[PDB]
Amino acid sequence: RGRIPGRQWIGKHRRPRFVSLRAKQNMIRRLEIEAENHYWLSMPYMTREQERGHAAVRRREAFEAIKAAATSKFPPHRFIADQLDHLNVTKKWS
Amino acid sequence: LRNRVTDRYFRIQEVLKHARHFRGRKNRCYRLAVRTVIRAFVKCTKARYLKKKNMRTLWINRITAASQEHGLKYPALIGNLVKCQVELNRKVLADLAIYEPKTFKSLAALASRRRHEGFAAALGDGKEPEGIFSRVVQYH
Amino acid sequence: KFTRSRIPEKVFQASPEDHEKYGGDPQNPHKLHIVTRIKSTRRRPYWEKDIIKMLGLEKAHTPQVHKNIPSVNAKLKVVKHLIRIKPLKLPQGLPAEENMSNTCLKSTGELVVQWHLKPV
Amino acid sequence: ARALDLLRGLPRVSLANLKPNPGSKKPERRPRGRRRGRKCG
Amino acid sequence: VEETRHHAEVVKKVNEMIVTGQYGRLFAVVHFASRQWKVTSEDLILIGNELDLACGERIRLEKVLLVG
Amino acid sequence: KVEGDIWALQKDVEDFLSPLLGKTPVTQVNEVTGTLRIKGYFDQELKAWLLEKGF
Amino acid sequence: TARGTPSRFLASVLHNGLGRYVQQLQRLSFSVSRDGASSRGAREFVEREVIDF
Ligand SMILES: [Mg+2]
Ligand SMILES: [Mg+2]
């Protein structure tokens, strides 16, 4: 008897949904977690002039390692051993 | 007509030996059979997932039954066993419910006493002794 | 139009009642953040996804240490709705070389340097 | 040389144990199967 | 105080039941390989991984959640 | 056209080209075709080097 | 597929491991060929590992 015109959750006329107690409690829980995040972000340790250059050496050496790998990309070696072990496929007993 | 296929019988036989126990033309006609063995295998994987879920639901139902036979409710039993630090899972809890009713009655009595101790602490709201079975064993 | 959000310094100024609600000393601030992602980056903007990847919180419920410095704080301020932030407490100090293989983080956010698996 | 000593140790070279140099024979891609069939690229 | 005394009486009397041997066919609930097994004597269990042990080898299961 | 210990040749080429680069040069040693490839243009330096060693 | 395959319960041969463990393998028959390139690895197994086993 009761039809929502078209699709239920899109359009001008939508099927109504109502907020439940557990949904409200879930949102309140996430809000509390974020208020605590606001507090722990509100207290900083250092300032910008104090942190201006404290990790430049480590960042530079990490990028130098990345450069070293990207430069060291290169084909691998080949072996007389490997070719002559492919010779072994005809190794009979007697 | 060089390079013809000669083991098509064996490929068809693989699909049909997986399709043998079906009903209708889909146990012997290769096209209808191969359209159904695929669905059987996909159902097998998704039913591994459904199997784990259904076994957990069955254990929960049996624990609810036995606890209600002891007058205790399932959330009370589970939460108070957790508070008493007895970490028996739902499988062995249902197993003890079915086969070992005296041990299950002991567990239900422990959970009910822990619930009563929690109620007493909540109503006291002060610094009374914590309770004999409400003591927390600490590890370090 | 939906854009990025500029968040006030007024909500990031703390207050005394906030201090006793979440006990934390304004002088002598805590040194390290324990950051843990508790929300998906799906149905979220690409910049938030990128900043999650930068901070290293791709796996949910996997805690990560970060510096309590203003740049890291700015990144966490952008992505603050997908994470939980705790102070890293050290009851018996920083780990040393002889106790580095017996550590545990614990749910209280206290990195103990000695772990026995024995009752107290 | 050492390679010739290995040849002395190893079985006989015939037409049954010959191999191309790896990397010289790129495999043929043909339109069969799921990946290379259907619309066939 | 009276409850701790009653606990001492019950724990003691159960201990001399153990000393005398007024029991038979014990069971245990044992944690093993992320599972909890309700096992008894002369029992069989199937673990879903290799165990780095030779066949027919005696070991001791230790993480006993429950015995009775 | 290298006969013999091409690995010894590789070691000599690496310790000769390391001061000119700072880092160890990137090389491939092919023992089947007795050849050695270095990543970079070092033709004149290697020619003068092999001259002064005597090849 | 479980529905199209046989099934059984967990069991031992003769209550194995109760009094003593008895190895349930009795015989191993190795059909190997002298000149088979397919049988090369089995030939190496017979040369080196079957005595220790
Ligand atoms: Mg409609
Ligand atoms: Mg098709």
Coordinates of C-alpha atoms and ligand atoms in Angstrom, one line a residue:
Chain A
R1 CA 0.0 0.0 0.0
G2 CA 2.8 2.4 0.9
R3 CA 5.3 2.9 -2.0
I4 CA 8.2 5.4 -2.1
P5 CA 8.2 6.8 -5.6
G6 CA 11.2 5.9 -7.7
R7 CA 14.2 4.7 -5.7
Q8 CA 14.1 4.7 -1.9
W9 CA 17.2 6.6 -0.9
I10 CA 17.6 9.1 -3.8
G11 CA 15.5 11.8 -5.3
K12 CA 13.0 14.4 -4.2
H13 CA 10.9 11.9 -2.3
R14 CA 13.0 9.6 -0.1
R15 CA 12.0 6.9 2.4
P16 CA 12.5 8.5 5.8
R17 CA 15.1 7.2 8.2
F18 CA 15.3 8.0 11.9
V19 CA 18.2 8.1 14.3
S20 CA 18.5 5.3 16.8
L21 CA 19.8 5.3 20.4
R22 CA 22.8 3.1 19.6
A23 CA 23.7 5.3 16.6
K24 CA 23.6 8.4 18.8
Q25 CA 25.8 6.6 21.4
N26 CA 28.3 5.6 18.6
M27 CA 28.5 9.2 17.5
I28 CA 29.0 10.4 21.1
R29 CA 31.8 7.9 21.6
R30 CA 33.7 9.1 18.5
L31 CA 33.1 12.7 19.5
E32 CA 34.8 12.0 22.9
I33 CA 37.7 10.2 21.3
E34 CA 38.2 13.3 19.1
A35 CA 37.9 15.8 22.0
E36 CA 40.7 13.9 23.6
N37 CA 42.7 14.1 20.3
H38 CA 42.1 17.8 20.4
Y39 CA 43.6 18.1 23.9
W40 CA 46.7 16.0 23.1
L41 CA 47.3 17.9 19.9
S42 CA 46.7 21.2 21.8
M43 CA 49.8 20.5 23.9
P44 CA 53.1 20.6 21.8
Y45 CA 56.6 19.8 22.9
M46 CA 58.9 22.0 20.7
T47 CA 58.4 25.1 18.5
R48 CA 59.1 25.7 14.9
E49 CA 62.4 27.6 15.4
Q50 CA 63.5 24.8 17.7
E51 CA 62.6 22.0 15.2
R52 CA 64.0 23.9 12.2
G53 CA 66.8 21.5 11.4
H54 CA 66.8 18.5 13.7
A55 CA 66.3 15.6 11.2
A56 CA 67.9 17.0 8.0
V57 CA 70.8 14.6 8.2
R58 CA 68.6 11.5 8.5
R59 CA 66.2 12.6 5.7
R60 CA 69.2 13.3 3.4
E61 CA 70.8 9.9 4.1
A62 CA 67.5 8.1 3.5
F63 CA 67.1 9.9 0.2
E64 CA 70.7 9.0 -0.6
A65 CA 70.0 5.4 0.0
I66 CA 67.0 5.6 -2.3
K67 CA 69.2 7.2 -5.0
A68 CA 71.8 4.5 -4.5
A69 CA 69.2 1.7 -5.1
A70 CA 67.7 3.5 -8.1
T71 CA 71.2 4.0 -9.6
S72 CA 72.3 0.4 -8.8
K73 CA 69.5 -1.1 -10.8
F74 CA 71.4 -3.1 -13.4
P75 CA 71.3 -6.7 -15.0
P76 CA 72.8 -9.7 -13.2
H77 CA 75.7 -12.0 -13.9
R78 CA 75.7 -15.1 -16.1
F79 CA 77.5 -18.4 -15.4
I80 CA 79.4 -21.1 -17.2
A81 CA 78.2 -23.2 -14.2
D82 CA 74.5 -22.6 -15.0
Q83 CA 74.9 -23.4 -18.7
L84 CA 76.9 -26.6 -18.0
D85 CA 74.4 -27.7 -15.4
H86 CA 71.7 -27.5 -18.1
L87 CA 74.0 -30.0 -19.8
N88 CA 72.9 -32.5 -17.0
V89 CA 69.4 -33.4 -18.4
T90 CA 70.9 -36.4 -20.2
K91 CA 72.7 -37.9 -17.1
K92 CA 72.0 -41.6 -17.3
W93 CA 73.0 -44.3 -14.9
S94 CA 74.8 -46.5 -17.4
Chain B
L1 CA 43.4 -30.7 -40.5
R2 CA 46.7 -30.8 -38.5
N3 CA 46.8 -30.1 -34.8
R4 CA 43.4 -31.3 -33.6
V5 CA 42.5 -31.8 -30.0
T6 CA 42.6 -35.4 -28.7
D7 CA 42.0 -35.2 -24.9
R8 CA 38.8 -33.2 -25.0
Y9 CA 37.1 -36.3 -23.5
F10 CA 39.4 -36.0 -20.5
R11 CA 38.8 -32.3 -20.0
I12 CA 35.0 -32.9 -20.2
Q13 CA 35.4 -35.8 -17.8
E14 CA 37.1 -33.6 -15.3
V15 CA 34.2 -31.1 -15.3
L16 CA 31.6 -34.0 -15.4
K17 CA 33.2 -35.9 -12.4
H18 CA 32.8 -32.7 -10.5
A19 CA 29.2 -32.5 -11.9
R20 CA 28.1 -36.1 -11.4
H21 CA 25.8 -35.9 -8.3
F22 CA 23.6 -33.2 -9.8
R23 CA 20.0 -33.3 -11.0
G24 CA 18.8 -33.1 -14.6
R25 CA 20.7 -32.5 -17.8
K26 CA 23.4 -30.6 -15.8
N27 CA 25.0 -33.9 -14.6
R28 CA 25.8 -35.1 -18.1
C29 CA 25.6 -32.2 -20.6
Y30 CA 29.0 -30.4 -20.5
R31 CA 27.6 -26.8 -21.1
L32 CA 24.9 -27.0 -18.4
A33 CA 27.3 -28.8 -16.1
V34 CA 30.2 -26.4 -16.4
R35 CA 27.7 -23.5 -15.7
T36 CA 26.9 -25.2 -12.4
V37 CA 30.2 -26.5 -11.1
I38 CA 31.5 -22.9 -11.1
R39 CA 28.7 -21.9 -8.8
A40 CA 29.2 -24.9 -6.6
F41 CA 32.9 -23.9 -6.0
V42 CA 32.0 -20.2 -5.4
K43 CA 29.3 -21.4 -2.9
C44 CA 32.0 -23.6 -1.2
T45 CA 34.2 -20.7 -0.5
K46 CA 31.5 -18.3 0.7
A47 CA 30.1 -21.2 2.8
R48 CA 33.4 -21.5 4.5
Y49 CA 32.8 -18.0 5.8
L50 CA 29.1 -18.8 6.5
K51 CA 30.2 -22.0 8.3
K52 CA 32.3 -20.1 10.8
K53 CA 29.5 -17.6 11.4
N54 CA 26.9 -20.3 11.8
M55 CA 28.9 -22.4 14.3
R56 CA 29.4 -19.3 16.4
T57 CA 25.7 -18.6 16.4
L58 CA 24.9 -22.2 17.3
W59 CA 27.3 -22.0 20.3
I60 CA 25.7 -18.8 21.4
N61 CA 22.3 -20.3 21.2
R62 CA 23.3 -23.4 23.3
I63 CA 25.0 -21.3 25.9
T64 CA 21.9 -19.1 26.2
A65 CA 19.8 -22.3 26.6
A66 CA 21.9 -23.8 29.4
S67 CA 22.3 -20.5 31.2
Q68 CA 18.6 -19.9 31.1
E69 CA 18.2 -23.4 32.6
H70 CA 20.4 -22.1 35.4
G71 CA 18.4 -18.8 35.6
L72 CA 21.2 -16.6 34.3
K73 CA 21.2 -14.7 31.1
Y74 CA 23.9 -15.0 28.3
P75 CA 25.3 -11.5 28.5
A76 CA 25.6 -11.8 32.3
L77 CA 27.3 -15.2 32.0
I78 CA 29.8 -14.0 29.4
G79 CA 30.6 -10.6 30.9
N80 CA 31.0 -12.0 34.4
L81 CA 33.2 -14.9 33.3
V82 CA 35.4 -12.2 31.5
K83 CA 35.4 -10.2 34.8
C84 CA 36.4 -13.3 36.7
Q85 CA 39.3 -13.8 34.1
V86 CA 38.1 -17.2 32.9
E87 CA 38.7 -17.0 29.2
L88 CA 36.8 -20.1 28.0
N89 CA 35.4 -19.4 24.6
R90 CA 31.9 -20.1 23.3
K91 CA 32.8 -23.5 21.8
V92 CA 34.1 -25.1 25.0
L93 CA 31.4 -23.3 27.0
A94 CA 28.7 -25.0 24.8
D95 CA 30.7 -28.2 25.1
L96 CA 30.7 -28.0 28.9
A97 CA 27.0 -27.1 28.8
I98 CA 26.1 -30.2 26.8
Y99 CA 28.4 -32.8 28.3
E100 CA 29.4 -31.5 31.8
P101 CA 26.4 -29.9 33.5
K102 CA 28.0 -29.8 37.0
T103 CA 31.0 -27.9 35.7
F104 CA 28.6 -25.6 33.8
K105 CA 26.6 -25.0 37.0
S106 CA 29.8 -24.1 38.8
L107 CA 30.6 -21.6 36.1
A108 CA 27.1 -20.2 36.2
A109 CA 27.3 -19.8 40.0
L110 CA 30.7 -18.1 39.6
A111 CA 29.2 -15.6 37.0
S112 CA 26.2 -14.9 39.2
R113 CA 28.3 -14.3 42.3
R114 CA 30.6 -12.0 40.2
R115 CA 27.4 -10.1 39.1
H116 CA 26.2 -9.8 42.7
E117 CA 29.6 -8.5 43.8
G118 CA 29.6 -5.9 41.0
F119 CA 26.1 -4.8 42.1
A120 CA 27.3 -4.6 45.7
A121 CA 30.3 -2.5 44.7
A122 CA 28.1 -0.2 42.5
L123 CA 25.6 0.4 45.3
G124 CA 28.4 0.9 47.9
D125 CA 30.2 3.4 45.7
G126 CA 32.9 3.9 48.3
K127 CA 36.1 2.2 49.3
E128 CA 34.8 -1.1 50.6
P129 CA 36.8 -4.3 50.1
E130 CA 36.7 -5.2 46.4
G131 CA 35.3 -8.7 46.8
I132 CA 36.8 -12.1 46.9
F133 CA 36.1 -13.1 43.3
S134 CA 36.4 -9.5 42.0
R135 CA 40.1 -9.4 42.7
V136 CA 42.3 -8.9 39.6
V137 CA 45.4 -11.1 39.1
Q138 CA 48.1 -8.8 37.7
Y139 CA 50.8 -9.9 35.3
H140 CA 54.1 -8.1 34.7
Chain C
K1 CA 32.0 23.4 -2.8
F2 CA 33.8 20.8 -0.6
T3 CA 37.3 21.9 0.2
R4 CA 39.9 21.3 2.9
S5 CA 39.1 22.6 6.4
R6 CA 41.0 25.2 8.3
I7 CA 40.8 24.4 12.0
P8 CA 40.9 27.1 14.7
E9 CA 43.8 27.7 17.1
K10 CA 40.9 28.4 19.5
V11 CA 39.9 24.7 19.5
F12 CA 43.6 23.9 19.7
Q13 CA 44.2 26.1 22.8
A14 CA 43.8 23.9 25.9
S15 CA 42.0 24.9 29.1
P16 CA 42.6 23.9 32.8
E17 CA 39.4 21.9 33.1
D18 CA 40.5 20.0 30.1
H19 CA 43.8 19.4 31.9
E20 CA 42.2 17.8 34.9
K21 CA 39.7 16.0 32.7
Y22 CA 42.6 14.5 30.7
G23 CA 45.4 14.7 33.3
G24 CA 48.4 16.2 31.5
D25 CA 50.9 18.8 32.6
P26 CA 51.1 21.9 30.4
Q27 CA 54.6 22.6 31.4
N28 CA 56.8 19.5 30.7
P29 CA 54.7 18.3 27.7
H30 CA 54.7 14.7 26.6
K31 CA 57.4 13.8 24.1
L32 CA 55.9 11.1 21.9
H33 CA 52.5 10.4 20.3
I34 CA 51.0 7.0 20.1
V35 CA 48.8 7.3 17.0
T36 CA 46.4 4.6 16.0
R37 CA 44.0 4.7 13.0
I38 CA 40.4 3.8 14.1
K39 CA 38.6 4.8 10.9
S40 CA 38.8 3.9 7.2
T41 CA 40.2 6.3 4.6
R42 CA 37.4 5.1 2.3
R43 CA 34.7 7.7 1.6
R44 CA 37.3 10.3 2.5
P45 CA 39.3 12.8 0.5
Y46 CA 42.5 11.9 -1.3
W47 CA 44.6 14.3 0.8
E48 CA 43.5 12.6 3.9
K49 CA 44.3 9.2 2.3
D50 CA 47.8 10.5 1.4
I51 CA 48.4 11.9 4.8
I52 CA 47.4 8.5 6.4
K53 CA 50.0 6.9 4.0
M54 CA 52.6 9.5 5.0
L55 CA 52.1 8.9 8.8
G56 CA 52.2 5.2 8.2
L57 CA 48.8 4.3 9.5
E58 CA 47.7 2.1 6.6
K59 CA 46.8 -0.8 8.9
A60 CA 44.1 -0.1 11.3
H61 CA 44.6 -0.7 15.1
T62 CA 48.4 -0.7 14.6
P63 CA 49.9 1.9 16.9
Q64 CA 52.8 4.1 15.7
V65 CA 55.1 6.5 17.5
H66 CA 55.5 10.1 16.2
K67 CA 57.2 13.2 17.4
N68 CA 55.1 15.8 19.4
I69 CA 56.5 18.5 17.1
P70 CA 54.4 21.2 15.3
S71 CA 54.8 19.7 11.8
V72 CA 53.6 16.2 12.8
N73 CA 51.0 17.9 14.9
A74 CA 49.7 19.8 11.8
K75 CA 49.5 16.5 9.9
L76 CA 47.6 14.9 12.7
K77 CA 45.4 18.0 12.9
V78 CA 44.4 17.5 9.3
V79 CA 43.7 13.8 9.8
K80 CA 42.5 14.0 13.4
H81 CA 39.1 12.4 12.7
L82 CA 40.4 9.0 11.7
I83 CA 42.9 8.5 14.5
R84 CA 43.3 8.2 18.3
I85 CA 46.2 10.0 19.9
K86 CA 47.7 9.1 23.2
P87 CA 50.8 10.2 25.1
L88 CA 53.6 7.6 25.2
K89 CA 54.4 7.1 28.9
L90 CA 57.7 5.6 30.1
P91 CA 57.3 4.5 33.7
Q92 CA 60.8 3.0 33.9
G93 CA 62.5 5.2 31.3
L94 CA 63.7 4.9 27.7
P95 CA 64.7 1.4 26.6
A96 CA 68.4 0.7 26.5
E97 CA 70.4 -1.9 24.5
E98 CA 70.2 -4.7 27.1
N99 CA 66.4 -4.4 27.5
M100 CA 65.4 -3.7 23.9
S101 CA 64.3 -7.4 23.4
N102 CA 61.9 -7.5 26.3
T103 CA 59.5 -4.6 25.6
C104 CA 55.7 -4.3 25.5
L105 CA 53.5 -1.3 24.7
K106 CA 50.4 -2.2 26.7
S107 CA 46.9 -0.7 26.3
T108 CA 47.5 2.1 28.8
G109 CA 50.2 3.5 26.5
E110 CA 53.1 2.7 28.8
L111 CA 56.1 1.1 27.1
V112 CA 57.6 -1.2 29.7
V113 CA 61.2 -2.3 29.1
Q114 CA 60.9 -5.5 31.0
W115 CA 58.3 -8.2 30.2
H116 CA 58.1 -11.4 32.3
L117 CA 54.7 -13.2 31.6
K118 CA 54.6 -13.9 35.3
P119 CA 52.0 -12.9 38.0
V120 CA 52.8 -10.1 40.4
Chain D
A1 CA 90.4 -24.4 -18.7
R2 CA 88.1 -24.9 -15.8
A3 CA 85.1 -24.9 -18.1
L4 CA 86.8 -27.6 -20.2
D5 CA 87.3 -29.6 -17.0
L6 CA 83.6 -29.3 -16.3
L7 CA 82.9 -30.5 -19.8
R8 CA 85.1 -33.6 -19.1
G9 CA 83.1 -34.2 -15.9
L10 CA 79.7 -33.6 -17.4
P11 CA 77.6 -35.9 -19.7
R12 CA 78.0 -35.8 -23.5
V13 CA 76.8 -32.9 -25.6
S14 CA 74.2 -34.2 -28.1
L15 CA 71.1 -32.9 -29.9
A16 CA 69.0 -33.8 -26.8
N17 CA 70.5 -31.4 -24.3
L18 CA 70.7 -28.1 -26.3
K19 CA 69.2 -24.9 -25.0
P20 CA 68.9 -21.3 -26.3
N21 CA 70.7 -18.6 -24.4
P22 CA 68.1 -17.3 -21.8
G23 CA 66.7 -14.0 -22.8
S24 CA 67.1 -14.6 -26.5
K25 CA 63.8 -16.3 -27.1
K26 CA 60.9 -14.0 -26.1
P27 CA 57.8 -16.2 -25.7
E28 CA 54.9 -15.8 -28.2
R29 CA 51.7 -14.1 -27.0
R30 CA 48.6 -15.5 -28.7
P31 CA 44.9 -14.7 -28.1
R32 CA 43.8 -17.7 -26.0
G33 CA 42.8 -18.0 -22.4
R34 CA 41.1 -15.6 -20.1
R35 CA 43.9 -12.9 -20.0
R36 CA 44.7 -12.7 -23.7
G37 CA 41.4 -13.9 -25.1
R38 CA 37.9 -12.3 -25.2
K39 CA 38.6 -9.0 -27.0
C40 CA 42.2 -10.1 -27.5
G41 CA 43.8 -6.7 -26.8
Chain E
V1 CA 36.6 -13.2 57.1
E2 CA 34.2 -16.2 57.5
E3 CA 34.1 -16.5 53.7
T4 CA 37.9 -16.7 53.5
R5 CA 37.8 -19.4 56.2
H6 CA 35.1 -21.3 54.2
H7 CA 37.3 -21.0 51.1
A8 CA 40.2 -22.4 53.1
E9 CA 38.1 -25.3 54.2
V10 CA 36.9 -26.1 50.7
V11 CA 40.3 -25.7 49.0
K12 CA 41.8 -27.9 51.7
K13 CA 39.2 -30.7 51.5
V14 CA 39.5 -30.7 47.7
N15 CA 43.2 -31.0 48.1
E16 CA 43.0 -34.1 50.3
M17 CA 40.5 -35.5 47.8
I18 CA 43.3 -35.1 45.3
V19 CA 45.8 -36.6 47.7
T20 CA 43.6 -39.7 48.4
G21 CA 42.7 -40.1 44.7
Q22 CA 38.9 -39.8 44.9
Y23 CA 38.6 -39.0 41.2
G24 CA 38.8 -40.7 37.8
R25 CA 38.7 -39.8 34.1
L26 CA 39.9 -36.2 34.4
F27 CA 39.2 -33.7 31.6
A28 CA 41.0 -30.5 30.7
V29 CA 40.3 -27.4 28.6
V30 CA 43.7 -26.6 27.0
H31 CA 44.8 -23.7 24.8
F32 CA 46.7 -24.9 21.8
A33 CA 47.4 -23.5 18.4
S34 CA 45.1 -20.5 18.9
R35 CA 42.2 -22.9 19.8
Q36 CA 40.6 -24.2 23.0
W37 CA 40.2 -28.0 23.2
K38 CA 38.2 -29.9 25.7
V39 CA 40.3 -33.0 25.9
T40 CA 40.5 -36.1 28.1
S41 CA 42.7 -39.1 28.3
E42 CA 43.0 -41.4 25.2
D43 CA 41.9 -38.6 23.0
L44 CA 42.5 -37.4 19.4
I45 CA 42.9 -33.8 18.2
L46 CA 43.7 -32.5 14.7
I47 CA 45.9 -29.4 14.5
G48 CA 45.8 -27.4 11.3
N49 CA 49.6 -26.9 10.9
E50 CA 52.9 -28.7 11.1
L51 CA 54.4 -28.8 14.5
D52 CA 58.2 -29.5 13.8
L53 CA 58.0 -32.8 15.6
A54 CA 58.7 -36.4 14.6
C55 CA 55.8 -38.9 14.5
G56 CA 55.0 -40.7 17.8
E57 CA 56.7 -38.1 20.0
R58 CA 55.7 -37.2 23.6
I59 CA 55.1 -33.6 24.4
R60 CA 53.5 -31.7 27.3
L61 CA 50.6 -29.4 26.8
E62 CA 50.9 -26.7 29.5
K63 CA 48.4 -23.9 28.9
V64 CA 45.6 -25.6 30.7
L65 CA 42.7 -23.2 31.1
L66 CA 40.6 -25.7 33.0
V67 CA 41.0 -29.1 34.7
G68 CA 38.4 -31.2 36.5
Chain F
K1 CA 87.8 -10.8 -25.1
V2 CA 88.8 -11.7 -21.6
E3 CA 90.3 -15.1 -20.8
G4 CA 90.9 -16.3 -17.3
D5 CA 89.8 -14.8 -13.9
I6 CA 87.2 -12.3 -15.1
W7 CA 86.3 -11.9 -11.4
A8 CA 89.9 -10.7 -10.7
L9 CA 89.4 -8.4 -13.7
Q10 CA 86.2 -7.1 -12.1
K11 CA 87.9 -6.5 -8.8
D12 CA 90.7 -4.6 -10.5
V13 CA 88.3 -2.5 -12.5
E14 CA 86.2 -1.7 -9.4
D15 CA 89.2 -0.7 -7.3
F16 CA 90.6 1.4 -10.2
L17 CA 87.3 3.2 -11.0
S18 CA 86.3 3.7 -7.3
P19 CA 88.5 6.8 -6.8
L20 CA 87.2 8.3 -10.0
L21 CA 83.5 7.9 -8.9
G22 CA 83.6 7.8 -5.1
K23 CA 81.2 4.8 -5.1
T24 CA 81.9 1.3 -6.3
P25 CA 81.1 1.2 -10.1
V26 CA 78.2 -1.0 -11.1
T27 CA 79.3 -4.0 -13.2
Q28 CA 78.1 -7.2 -14.9
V29 CA 80.5 -10.1 -15.4
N30 CA 79.5 -12.4 -18.2
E31 CA 81.5 -15.6 -18.0
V32 CA 79.9 -17.3 -21.1
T33 CA 80.8 -14.4 -23.4
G34 CA 83.9 -13.4 -21.5
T35 CA 82.9 -9.8 -21.1
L36 CA 82.4 -7.2 -18.5
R37 CA 80.0 -4.2 -18.5
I38 CA 80.4 -1.1 -16.4
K39 CA 77.6 1.4 -16.0
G40 CA 79.0 4.6 -17.4
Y41 CA 81.4 5.9 -20.1
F42 CA 85.0 4.9 -19.1
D43 CA 86.4 3.9 -22.5
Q44 CA 89.5 6.2 -22.6
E45 CA 90.4 5.6 -19.0
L46 CA 90.1 1.8 -19.4
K47 CA 92.0 1.8 -22.6
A48 CA 94.9 3.7 -21.0
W49 CA 94.7 1.5 -18.0
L50 CA 94.9 -1.7 -20.0
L51 CA 97.8 -0.2 -22.0
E52 CA 99.7 0.5 -18.8
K53 CA 99.0 -3.0 -17.5
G54 CA 100.3 -4.3 -20.8
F55 CA 97.4 -5.8 -22.7
Chain G
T1 CA 33.3 -30.0 -2.6
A2 CA 32.1 -31.7 0.6
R3 CA 28.7 -32.7 -0.8
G4 CA 30.2 -34.4 -3.8
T5 CA 33.1 -36.3 -2.0
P6 CA 33.3 -38.9 0.7
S7 CA 33.8 -38.0 4.4
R8 CA 34.9 -39.8 7.6
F9 CA 35.6 -39.1 11.2
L10 CA 39.0 -38.7 13.0
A11 CA 40.5 -42.0 13.8
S12 CA 43.7 -44.1 14.2
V13 CA 44.6 -47.5 12.8
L14 CA 44.8 -49.5 16.1
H15 CA 44.5 -46.9 18.9
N16 CA 47.9 -45.7 17.8
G17 CA 50.0 -43.9 20.3
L18 CA 48.2 -45.2 23.4
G19 CA 50.6 -47.9 24.5
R20 CA 53.2 -47.3 21.8
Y21 CA 53.5 -45.7 18.4
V22 CA 53.8 -48.0 15.4
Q23 CA 54.7 -46.5 12.1
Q24 CA 51.9 -47.2 9.7
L25 CA 54.0 -47.2 6.5
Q26 CA 54.9 -50.8 5.6
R27 CA 56.3 -50.9 2.0
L28 CA 57.8 -48.4 -0.5
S29 CA 58.2 -49.6 -4.1
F30 CA 60.3 -47.4 -6.3
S31 CA 59.8 -47.9 -10.0
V32 CA 62.8 -46.0 -11.6
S33 CA 64.4 -46.1 -15.0
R34 CA 68.1 -46.1 -15.9
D35 CA 67.9 -43.8 -18.9
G36 CA 64.9 -41.7 -18.1
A37 CA 65.4 -37.9 -18.1
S38 CA 62.1 -37.9 -16.2
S39 CA 63.6 -40.4 -13.8
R40 CA 66.9 -38.4 -13.3
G41 CA 65.8 -37.0 -9.9
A42 CA 64.6 -40.4 -8.7
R43 CA 68.0 -41.8 -9.8
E44 CA 69.8 -39.2 -7.7
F45 CA 67.5 -40.1 -4.8
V46 CA 68.4 -43.7 -5.1
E47 CA 72.1 -42.8 -5.3
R48 CA 72.2 -40.6 -2.2
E49 CA 69.1 -40.6 0.0
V50 CA 67.4 -44.0 0.0
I51 CA 70.0 -45.6 2.2
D52 CA 69.7 -43.0 5.0
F53 CA 65.9 -43.2 4.8
Ligands
MG1 MG 10.9 2.0 -7.1
MG2 MG 33.3 -16.3 -24.0

